[model samples]
Target: AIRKKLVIVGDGAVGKTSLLIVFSKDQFPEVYVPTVFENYVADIEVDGKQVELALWDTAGQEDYPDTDVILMVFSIDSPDSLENIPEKWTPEVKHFCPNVPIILVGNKKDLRNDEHTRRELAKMKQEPVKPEEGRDMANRIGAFGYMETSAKTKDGVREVFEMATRAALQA
Candidate 1:
């Protein structure tokens, strides 16, 4: 099987480890102290071809090394998460990955209320951390696509894997 590397990037406690385990092993860790770097290899089928997605979940310490793709996780309700997009994270991603692909994740969507849309849109208009914004950033930085994920409610989480795997295979 062909192997592709996918690194998960985000601030501490942004559900990077959880999303990794949830999608890779269909399990979750009991106690999490924030993962520095953990690797997992999983086989997934895309376009009728077998492929191995070697995922690397890393801490938000320094600029992570370049990989096949990036799963950029952040909380939708957390302002800091959104702020990190262009401030430090995206630039570092661009510096290291250069031409890699990135899938932006806006987690914690289930924790929001109806007012969330207006608030998120306001933030988007001001900062634009949505998928399209991320995709645009990816385009600028040479990434492939964007997505949002949630582990607490398992919402949009699987799509991250699906999209990454699909894109990796297509590439």
Candidate 2:
């Protein structure tokens, strides 16, 4: 069995916990609780191999040590969340875990084209983060890969873990 440590970091209310919980437990949390720090273990299979994948949810208030991989999440509905990746996370992760692989994740895929979400963002003179924009950022930051997921619909959730695990295993 192989153990890999994965840490998730991003701006507050960006659905980082939602993604981890939905992927690990298959449950979508209805209430939004701010996570100070949380950790979960999922025995997942990737390419016919069993992995004891450790998922860590962080508050983005400080640096986390001993991370094998990083899932830097941003909500598609919140453009500012995407912006913070370059402004905040990139520098911090590079400073603490320079060689760790980063997987840039865009959360809330279901809202990227939703009417309500668009209207809400428009009210603030902002728009959702498009997939191309996310991909560009991932490339700009030298992330291992880029994936978009919707925790509400469970879309692209497993692939994120699979890719992250692949990166960790390769590392």
Q: Which stretches of candidate 2 lie over 4 Å from their true place?
A: 26-39, 60-65
lDDT of 2 by residue, 7-110 (tens): 98998888887887777664233434333335566677789788877778886553433778999999999999899999999999899899999999999999
Clashing pairs in 1: none
- Which ten residues in a row are the worst by lDDT in model 1? 27-36
- Backbone clashes, candidate 1: 0
User: For this target, which candidate reaches the highest lDDT against the unseen true structure?
Assistant: 2
Give the residue spans of candidate 1 off by over 4 A: 27-37, 60-66, 114-143
- Minimum summed lDDT over a 10-residue window in model 2 is located at 27-36
Give me candidate 2's TM-score against the actual structure.
0.88
**Would you give me the overall lDDT of model 2?**
0.85
Per-candidate local distance difference test: 0.67, 0.85
Model 1: per-residue Cα lDDT over 67-157, one tens digit each: 7777777765565676677677788877887766677777766655547555765765533244565456556544456566668778777
